[PDB]
Design a protein around this ligand. Sequence first.
Ligand SMILES: [Mg+2]
Ligand SMILES: [Mg+2]
Ligand SMILES: [Mg+2]
Ligand SMILES: [Mg+2]
Ligand SMILES: [Mg+2]
Ligand SMILES: [Mg+2]
Ligand SMILES: [Mg+2]
Ligand SMILES: [Mg+2]
Ligand SMILES: [Mg+2]
Ligand SMILES: [Mg+2]
Ligand SMILES: [Mg+2]
Length: 231
Amino acid sequence: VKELLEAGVHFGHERKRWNPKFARYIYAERNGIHIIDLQKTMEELERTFRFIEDLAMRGGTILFVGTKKQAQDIVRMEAERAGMPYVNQRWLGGMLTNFKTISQRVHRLEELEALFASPEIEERPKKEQVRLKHELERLQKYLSGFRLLKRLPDAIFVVDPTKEAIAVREARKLFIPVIALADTDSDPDLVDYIIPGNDDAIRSIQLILSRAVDLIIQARGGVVEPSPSYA
RNA sequence: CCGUCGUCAGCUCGUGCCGUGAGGUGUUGGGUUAAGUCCCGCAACGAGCGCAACCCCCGCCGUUAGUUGCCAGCGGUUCG
Ligand SMILES: [Mg+2]
Ligand SMILES: [Mg+2]
Ligand SMILES: [Mg+2]
Ligand SMILES: [Mg+2]
Ligand SMILES: [Mg+2]
Ligand SMILES: [Mg+2]
Ligand SMILES: [Mg+2]
Ligand SMILES: [Mg+2]
Ligand SMILES: [Mg+2]
Ligand SMILES: [Mg+2]
Ligand SMILES: [Mg+2]
């Protein structure tokens, strides 16, 4: 499952826009660029996946965090493939720390599902349709992956702990383990299970996500061959 | 019970987040409207009292009804 042709996909980026805590996972600066010791990536995959694999067979949910436009679509395929929740658009404040309240806003979604599946009155004003439809069209935009989540995840898995510091912040306050693919602009000490790698190139996001999705499905009852990606 | 600022676009709440704390946040920000009006954005997410709507008068048309009201037509018409 592990693989070594990762250097055929990322080895890292971003110059002196670095975070000094990450130096322990950096090989050298060549291309005017911080370069990640890929060896140092394997070590942490071994330990991180052990967590994920051990987390797999226990039948426990995982929240998928990626919202930079470089990792936007690629998380949506993969979280569904493993049948687990994600956030694609905005990470709402209090998704975790205020779950019962945020998820009180999925009950409005599930309730819209039914109402627009006929009939429960269509003699409701034309303009109210206009209003309700768009609201469904609005709600749908954000919550499509969060709706699966019906309880606090036993872990969360992140693309950018720097870009999604808020997510990381809530998880911490809820003692939830934090997992993340994360490059040198990020804060290492902040993540429990670290995948020290490029977090912007779609290449790198595909390799590390999918193979982690596969490790999840492998120990969660079955296996399957390849998954969708743009070249 | 009333005047009043003021028919002005405002005033808050629940939870979460922030601050030792008063409190902030949301309610700020772009745009739009008669309006916290609606949109877009966002550690905020919703809820409430207000705005608006629902009620009355007027402007067009219709159905129903035709006296004490009306008279288009015809006939009588002392001439109403
Ligand atoms: Mg990065
Ligand atoms: Mg509060
Ligand atoms: Mg202060
Ligand atoms: Mg406090
Ligand atoms: Mg307060
Ligand atoms: Mg105000
Ligand atoms: Mg205020
Ligand atoms: Mg404004
Ligand atoms: Mg006004
Ligand atoms: Mg309003
Ligand atoms: Mg706001």
